[PDB]
Amino acid sequence: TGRLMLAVGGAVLGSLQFGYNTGVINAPQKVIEEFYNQTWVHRYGESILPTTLTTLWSLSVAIFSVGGMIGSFSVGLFVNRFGRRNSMLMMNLLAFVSAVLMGFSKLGKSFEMLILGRFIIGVYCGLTTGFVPMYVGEVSPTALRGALGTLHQLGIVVGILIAQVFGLDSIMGNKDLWPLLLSIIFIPALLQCIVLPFCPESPRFLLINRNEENRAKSVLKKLRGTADVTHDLQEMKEESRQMMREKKVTILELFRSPAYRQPILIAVVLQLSQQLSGINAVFYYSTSIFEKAGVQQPVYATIGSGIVNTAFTVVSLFVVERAGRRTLHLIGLAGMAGCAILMTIALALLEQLPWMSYLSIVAIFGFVAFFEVGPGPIPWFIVAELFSQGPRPAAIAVAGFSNWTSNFIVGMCFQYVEQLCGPYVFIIFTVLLVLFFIFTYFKVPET
Numbered sequence: 001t002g003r004l005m006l007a008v009g010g011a012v013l014g015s016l017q018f019g020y021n022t023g024v025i026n027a028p029q030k031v032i033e034e035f036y037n038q039t040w041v042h043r044y045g046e047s048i049l050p051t052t053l054t055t056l057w058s059l060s061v062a063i064f065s066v067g068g069m070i071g072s073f074s075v076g077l078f079v080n081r082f083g084r085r086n087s088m089l090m091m092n093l094l095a096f097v098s099a100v101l102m103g104f105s106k107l108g109k110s111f112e113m114l115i116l117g118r119f120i121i122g123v124y125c126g127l128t129t130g131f132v133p134m135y136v137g138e139v140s141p142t143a144l145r146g147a148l149g150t151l152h153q154l155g156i157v158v159g160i161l162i163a164q165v166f167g168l169d170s171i172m173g174n175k176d177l178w179p180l181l182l183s184i185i186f187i188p189a190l191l192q193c194i195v196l197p198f199c200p201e202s203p204r205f206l207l208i209n210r211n212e213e214n215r216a217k218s219v220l221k222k223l224r225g226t227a228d229v230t231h232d233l234q235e236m237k238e239e240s241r242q243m244m245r246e247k248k249v250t251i252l253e254l255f256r257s258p259a260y261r262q263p264i265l266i267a268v269v270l271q272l273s274q275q276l277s278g279i280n281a282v283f284y285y286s287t288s289i290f291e292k293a294g295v296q297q298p299v300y301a302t303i304g305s306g307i308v309n310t311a312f313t314v315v316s317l318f319v320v321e322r323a324g325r326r327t328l329h330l331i332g333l334a335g336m337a338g339c340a341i342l343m344t345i346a347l348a349l350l351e352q353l354p355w356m357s358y359l360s361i362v363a364i365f366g367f368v369a370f371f372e373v374g375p376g377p378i379p380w381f382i383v384a385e386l387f388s389q390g391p392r393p394a395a396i397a398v399a400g401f402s403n404w405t406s407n408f409i410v411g412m413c414f415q416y417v418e419q420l421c422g423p424y425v426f427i428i429f430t431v432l433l434v435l436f437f438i439f440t441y442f443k444v445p446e447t
């Protein structure tokens with residue numbers, strides 16, 4: 001358990017980087033848009049059109065989701081061929097390439113570099129959410145396996161928060177240091193590049209994927225700390241039997257047979273309910289929505305949503321196992337549906353009452369606080385509980401595609417919907433939050 005901390009802590013760095021890159025583009029939105037118009041003038045002697053500047057910057061945040069899709073498609077490619085440890089170590093290449101492309105984007109007067117960098121890091125982030133959850137599971141003892149598996153989620157939320165903190169005007173969220181705000185990912189990457197070579201390879205990769213019965217226990221004896229591991233070594237050979245007993249079905253065989261078309265419908269929808277609820281409307285445009293209200297120091301209100309999100313993440317841990325899963329998901333959608341309304345109330349009466357800007361903060365704070373106990377974790381505590389070791393890997397891949405797709409719809413189209421709906425944007429979220437509430441109250445079972 002001593003050497004165990006190093007093997008995990010070096011893997012979580014990717015999940016911290018996952019959370020970072022997700023929420024870096026929140027506070028420094030205004031300053032990077034000023035760079036886009038400044039580049040547009042220098043090239044063509046012309047101020048950029050606002051509708052074009054919108055779809056252009058929306059593409060700069062949304063393309064990251066497209067990368068995540070490809071990445072989560074390719075997790076199995078590198079995992080089973082190159083290993084778990086060696087995969088996370090080489091994929092730091094993308095992080096550096098992306099840091100260079102985004103850091104030197106301003107110096108080259110190229111928004112293409114920034115977009116291209118935002119994409120490459122998206123690939124890294126789509127792969128990371130397959131490497132890290134898998135590596136920590138194939139490392140920790142069965143007892144500590146449930147607890148240490150949480151550090152991935154915490155890495156996402158804390159990473160978002162650090163990005164929003166560094167997004168202040170005092171620090172890096174300004175006209176001078178926004179290229180460094182995007183590029184600072186090289187530090188965690190360089191740290192993980194130093195740590196991982198000293199971390200142990202996944203025993204399950206040595207035992208199964210490479211048939212090294214004796215080299216495996218050479219790891220667990222230093223990893224588990226215990227001298228012998230005769231029982232754990234056989235625990236792996238017991239689930240290797242249970243994982244490979246039934247044929248692992250493919251994505252194609254999942255849609256075809258009508259034995260899986262009802263569980264998958266639940267899986268996909270619950271993924272759409274995580275994204276089309278509209279939390280990445282906050283975690284991407286928090287500082288923009290708050291400014292559209294009457295918020296003073298709007299970047300701090302985003303850090304508030306970041307802190308609130310971190311808080312209720314920890315609370316959720318002691319509630320998921322302490323209560324049901326149908327209930328915590330219905331409560332979540334209902335809470336978000338109320339805050340989405342409370343937002344519209346706080347956004348409509350603000351023009352008359354110069355203090356509803358405070359209510360908008362209370363609203364979004366509850367909007368993300370309820371998400372973290374409902375449509376955040378539950379969609380993963382059901383898909384895995386709807387498929388055995390055979391068709392489960394195929395369900396993750398579809399849910400991954402379903403998650404990145406829906407996440408791309410929000411991140412890309414939210415600013416196109418905001419110019420038309422005005423204060424009635426969160427109505428769409430409120431509508432969808434109801435459809436997802438109806439669907440779960442009837443067509444979704446309990447586990």
Ligand SMILES: COc1ccc(CC(=O)N[C@@H](Cc2ccccc2Br)C(=O)N[C@@H](C)c2ccccc2)cc1
Nearest residue numbers: 072126129130133156376377380384396399400403
């Ligand atoms: C079952 O294995 C897991 C467990 C947890 C996770 C965590 C995660 O990435 N969850 C959401 C996003 C999210 C969760 C909780 C709070 C805020 C947010 Br934003 C996600 O985007 N997953 C994507 C990256 C994914 C889905 C399926 C397969 C690969 C990647 C991923 C796979």
